[PDB]
Each structure stands twice: as C-alpha cells, then as structure tokens.
Symmetry: C2
Subunit: 134 residues, 2 copies
Amino acid sequence: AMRQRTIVCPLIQNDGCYLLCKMADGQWALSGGGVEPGERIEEALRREIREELGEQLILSDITPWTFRDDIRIKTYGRQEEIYMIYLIFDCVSANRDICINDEFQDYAWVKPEELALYDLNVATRHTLALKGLL
Amino acid sequence: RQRTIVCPLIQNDGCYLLCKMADNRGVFPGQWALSGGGVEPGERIEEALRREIREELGEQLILSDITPWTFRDDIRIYMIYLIFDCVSANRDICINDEFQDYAWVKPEELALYDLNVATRHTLALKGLL
C-alpha cells in the first residue's frame, strides 16, 4: 500500500536557455506535478504549466522525451516512502512570459553552461545530466 | 481507468525480437508485437518488465542492459506505455500465453511483418521502419 504516483515534468527551452524554478522555502528545479484521475498525461502537463508558470507562456512544441523511477521518503507529521514514475517532456516555448505561483519563489532562463552554477535538487541534476546539459 | 504498461525493445547482435500474438483467430492472423506487461501495486517498473520477459519469453533469456527509452499514451481504458531499450546476452526464447511464435529480425526487414498498431508506432518512432 505504498504511495505511488506518476509525475509529469517539462524541460522547457527557449532560444537555447532552460527554465529553472526556485522552490519556495529551497532548491532550483524543473516544474511538474501529478497526473490526476481522468487526465491524459499531456493534459496534466499543460494544467501544471498553467498553474505554476501562468497563462501567458506559449508552448510551440511538447514531445515525450524519457522516463525513470525514483523513491523518496517524505515527512508531512509522519514519514512515508513514495514511489514515483517521472515522465519527462521536452518543451519549446515560443516566448519567455512566466508568471509564478506560490509553489515557486523565483525563476530563471539559464544557458546550459551556467546550469551547474545553480543549487539544483537531485532529480533536476539527474534529468539535466541525462540530457547532456550538465 | 488507469494502466501502466512496460514494453521491451529487445535486441541481440543487430537483430530485434518480434513475437507473434496468440490473440486472434480464424483466417485473421495474429499480428507481430513487442511484449507488454502490467505493473502491480508496489512493483518497480523494471521489475515488472523483467517479470513480463520471464513470463512470456522464459527465464533463460539474459539481459545485458535495460535502459528507459521513451513513453506515450494510448486507449483501448487509458494506458501509459513505458518503452525500454534492452540488449539480451542470448537468443534463447521460450514462449507461453501472450505469444505463439517469435523471430529475430534485421532492422531492414521489420516493415515486412504484420505489426500491430502500437508496435508499428513504436518502431517508426525509433526510426526502424
């Protein structure tokens, strides 16, 4: 009866720079969220983007890239293991118009050569390294 | 409503494994496909993949590498397909319920087989057709 979820995450690129979001108190990460009952995976992705990054952002292309699993121990206040499947999509944005919500404290469009300067969380480092960007 | 399916694109020494579905009858031939298995609650996706392979292709098949490739979705129930690139150390196959025959196929001959829709889309995306 372990908690298990499928998570959709977009790696958003514009004019060669990648979007990173700073989690509210707090590391830098890709955005993303869970797929809810009755939703298709891309529907969940677009919903998460609207919610977290706003309605001004315009995506030109969304393409499934790769997936992996992860196990995390979350502390709500009790501790529980959560098994996740990460579905990572390559996204190209037509613009850079971002409007953040309370899940994020800040955001940045970062050139690949500067990604390593950021205090990224573990999952984000893994994803970027697999893409050959880090 | 929700199902996660794991599928291996298995290759050995330049050839890819295709399996002929037992699913279908009369004059309508069973189509050729990649193996596909469900993931039980609490089961890791790679463990589910290895279980599917053991169940439908036999325990004798040794995998030298299993690497996530890509995913997509489909409907039949809403499915999420998780497709892995795999390399087998050998070509020993022993089939059971899902399949009635198998073949190791050169990439240039894959298109000659009557591939099911999902398999066709997957091989096309891989650049093999």
